[PDB]
């Protein structure tokens, strides 16, 4: 290992001693990758061992199995689990690959060359050789593009993926004719992030998702080649700090943004996160409650269209600020929700009064009731319901877990952008250790600020 | 230097000779913060009532409409808007924009931009003065909390109507409804936040008292001791060894913190970390995770429920819940 006397970094910053040790840095990164794959495999095995296909996935607190099921792999129409074996196969494969990666990390961390510059020039970066850093970026960018095209191939020629918008309760569909139109695909990124627009979180079709991943894979491969064969422009040299900690800070900012995006994706989106596996969203549960009570009071005579609430605004139906007919009550805040079980009841001007009277099918009612009883509300100790409950139900929605956890991770990695980026700037300038004490900048400035 | 006007402009913007440091983060902080200040002042003084709950029941929050400073507030945006973007040009008229709570959204957006650029500006001046750039990291904790109570919680709950009102009584209402719907007191992250503010107060008092006591005699009686210290003294005017000895003898020897640097890092890290944790707690509860729910957790041999203090807390929570929005609920479960 190392010591503080020869490095200047204490034990609580010991990995910082690896900044200029290329081989051991590679070993550490490979070991952490092996850790990631090991958690993937072990947690997948844990979930399948604790899984009963009779109950819905979101009832049993599973996060990885919904991810595998969204890709097909043993789900029938309506999100019914047919074979749990593919989940087991995925767990075993990720686990064994993790064993291999862990051995590799151990080797490259203990016995492998400490610095790769001399013996292995192909792997000998210098943290300031801009061409070499761009080459590494290009290699890993090509790998990412290949992964995106792998997803596209899975959806195209390998059984498709689980479309929750398919007629009926949703089913595994083979996506043909992906949305490869530039305007449609790039209109999401420039779309507003507010209500009704939702930025890229509001992607609703599988065709749009597959076309977008097509564009991203192609662009990532092309950009990998470009960043391989080119050196940053002279204006790029002046704009950025060129050090390992600087690159780390840039990546930290990027992945903090991605973590926030994933949190919002899990909370709001129900296309890439079908409610059959992840359970209803917040808006979905609220709309489901309103719909269930509407159909209950409509079955008991009454006329929900003319039913006036206590505020004089409409007990079951009202008009969105734009004019679209929407469910009344507080759920008017979620009027822009769209779900597989409510779209058939929507006409050109929103919810249709005629369809809401006779076109409702029993499966829609059952799904709405189930979503209402499993709203994404829970406690820290996994007690379902609002904060004022009887501590009888054991349920917290997987969407809530994903949203909370990855939001915390996104915030902490933004703090990482701040910390590691400021330190990169200071170290490049030379202030990393403190004021000069012989030539303070402030003492060279005119008084009174 | 360069005769170009752009170079002169960049020199002036980044100049450290300004009374207040403008920066590149400054050129976004100044307009957004000024816009937010103007709108907040004019709305707090004279703004018509706002239909916060979307039930056509406007709430008065301005001084001109019979409010004092304690009760006055800038009412959050209408629940009918939800998370929709509501700029002035979107509304048909200024009257409608005022009625639906547009000023709250305007102030919140321009203010969030302002505080982010304020943190960036703190970093920028640290870089320009040749100092370590981690005051912004400490300042991130208030920014995190403000984002949680103004942006993240509305996003999780699906409406800006659930954001904290820009007022005092509005703040208290937000706190009470939050406790009703999430049991924040039992959440371990408000626990860490409370420990953080109490520890901040304790350590501030402890450190200030120790430094003031250790202050070496450079000024005699008949005047304030502050005259002993000079702004350019460039020396420690207090005996650190005596203060460390006192603190060690007070509780137990070898209590560490003989380093001034270690002591000040601890002072920086305790409240900042705890405020980070409590802001994360607010955001996680915004995604409906809530605190511990030990209601009816204790039962006797036959099955009778034995009440606990958690049950009394639940009774108070029920009291808050059934009254927080009298007319906005048409169905038994809030869920929103």
């Amino acid at each position: 290992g190392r010591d503080q006397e020869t490095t200047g970094f204490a034990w609580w910053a010991g990995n910082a001693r690896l900044i200029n040790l290329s081989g051991k840095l590679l070993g550490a990164h490979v070991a952490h990758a092996g850790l990631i794959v090991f958690w993937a495999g072990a947690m997948n095995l844990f979930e399948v061992s604790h899984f009963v296909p009779e109950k819905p996935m979101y009832e049993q607190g599973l996060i990885l199995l919904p991810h595998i099921a969204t890709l097909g792999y043993g789900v029938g129409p309506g999100g019914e689990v047919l074979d749990t074996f593919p989940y087991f196969v995925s767990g075993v494969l990720h686990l064994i690959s993790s064993a291999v990666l862990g051995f590799g990390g151990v080797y490259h961390s203990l016995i492998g060359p400490e610095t790769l510059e001399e013996s292995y020039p192909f792997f000998g970066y210098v943290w300031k050789d801009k061409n070499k850093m761009t080459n590494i970026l290009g290699y890993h960018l090509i790998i990412l593009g290949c992964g995106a095209w792998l997803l596209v191939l899975k959806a195209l020629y390998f059984g498709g993926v689980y479309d929750t918008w398919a007629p009926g309760g949703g089913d595994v569909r083979i996506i043909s004719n992906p949305t490869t139109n530039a305007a449609i695909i790039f209109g999401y990124i420039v779309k507003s992030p507010f209500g009704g627009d939702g930025w890229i979180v509001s992607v609703d079709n599988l065709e749009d998702i597959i076309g977008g991943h097509i564009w991203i894979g192609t662009l990532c491969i092309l950009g990998g080649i470009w960043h391989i064969y080119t050196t940053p422009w002279p204006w790029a040299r002046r704009a950025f700090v060129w050090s390992g900690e600087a690159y780390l800070s840039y990546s930290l900012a990027a992945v903090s943004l991605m973590g926030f995006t994933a949190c919002c994706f899990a909370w709001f989106n129900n296309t890439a996160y079908p409610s059959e596996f992840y359970g209803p969203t917040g808006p979905e549960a609220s709309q489901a409650q309103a719909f269930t009570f509407l159909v209950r009071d409509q079955r008991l005579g009454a006329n929900v269209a003319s039913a006036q609430g206590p505020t004089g605004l409409g007990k079951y139906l009202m008009r969105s600020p734009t004019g679209e007919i929407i469910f009344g009550g507080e759920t008017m805040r979620f009027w822009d929700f769209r779900g597989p079980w409510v779209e058939p009841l929507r006409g050109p001007s929103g919810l249709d009064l005629v369809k809401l009277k006779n076109d409702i099918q029993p499966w829609q009612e059952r799904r709405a009731a189930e979503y209402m009883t499993h709203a994404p509300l829970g406690s820290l100790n996994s007690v379902g319901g609002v904060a004022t409950e009887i501590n009888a139900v054991n349920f917290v929605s997987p969407r809530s877990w994903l949203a909370t956890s990855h939001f915390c991770l996104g915030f902490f990695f933004f703090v990482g952008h701040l910390w590691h980026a400021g330190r990169a700037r200071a170290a490049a300038a030379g202030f990393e250790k403190g004021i000069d004490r012989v030539d303070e900048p402030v003492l060279s400035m005119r008084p009174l600020d | 230097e360069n005769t170009s006007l752009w170079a002169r402009f960049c020199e002036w913007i980044t100049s450290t000779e300004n009374r207040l440091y403008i920066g590149w983060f400054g050129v976004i902080m100044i307009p957004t913060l000024l816009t937010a200040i103007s709108v907040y002042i004019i709305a707090f003084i004279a703004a018509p009532p706002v239909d916060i709950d979307g039930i056509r029941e406007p709430v008065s929050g301005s001084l001109l409409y019979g409010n004092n400073i304690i009760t006055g507030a800038v009412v959050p945006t209408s629940n009918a808007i939800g998370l929709h973007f509501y700029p002035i040009w979107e509304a048909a008229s200024l009257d409608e924009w005022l009625y639906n709570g547009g000023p709250y959204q305007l102030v919140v957006c321009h203010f969030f931009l302002g505080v982010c650029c304020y943190m960036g500006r703190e970093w920028e001046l640290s870089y320009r003065l040749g100092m370590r750039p981690w005051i912004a990291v400490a300042y991130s904790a208030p920014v995190a909390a403000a984002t949680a109570v103004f942006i993240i919680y509305p996003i999780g709950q699906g409406s800006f109507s659930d954001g904290m009102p820009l007022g005092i009584s509005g703040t208290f209402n937000f706190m009470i409804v939050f406790q009703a719907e999430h049991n924040i007191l039992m959440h371990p992250f408000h626990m860490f936040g409370v420990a953080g503010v109490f520890g901040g107060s304790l350590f501030s008092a402890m450190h200030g008292s120790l430094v003031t006591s250790s202050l070496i005699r450079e000024t005699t009686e008949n005047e304030s001791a502050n005259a002993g210290y000079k702004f350019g003294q460039e020396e420690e005017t207090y005996n650190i060894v005596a203060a460390h000895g006192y603190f060690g003898r007070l509780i137990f020897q070898y209590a560490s913190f003989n380093n001034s640097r270690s002591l000040h890092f601890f002072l920086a890290v305790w409240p900042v970390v705890c405020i980070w944790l409590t802001a994360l707690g607010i955001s996680t509860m915004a995604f409906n995770l809530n605190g511990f729910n030990f209601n009816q957790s204790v039962v006797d041999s036959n099955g009778r429920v034995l009440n606990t203090w958690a049950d009394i807390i639940n009774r108070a929570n029920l009291g808050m819940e059934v009254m927080h929005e009298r007319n906005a609920h048409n169905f038994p479960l809030d869920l929103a």
Partner: peptide
């Protein structure tokens, strides 16, 4: 009339802040 008093108090506080910022006594080094 209460609104007038509240506005005056807020304006006074803001003016005091402005004077304490831009008309402060210079920090005398040594």
């Amino acid at each position: 009339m209460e609104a007038l008093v509240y506005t005056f108090l807020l304006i006074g506080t803001l003016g005091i802040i402005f004077f304490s910022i831009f008309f402060r006594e210079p920090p005398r080094i040594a």
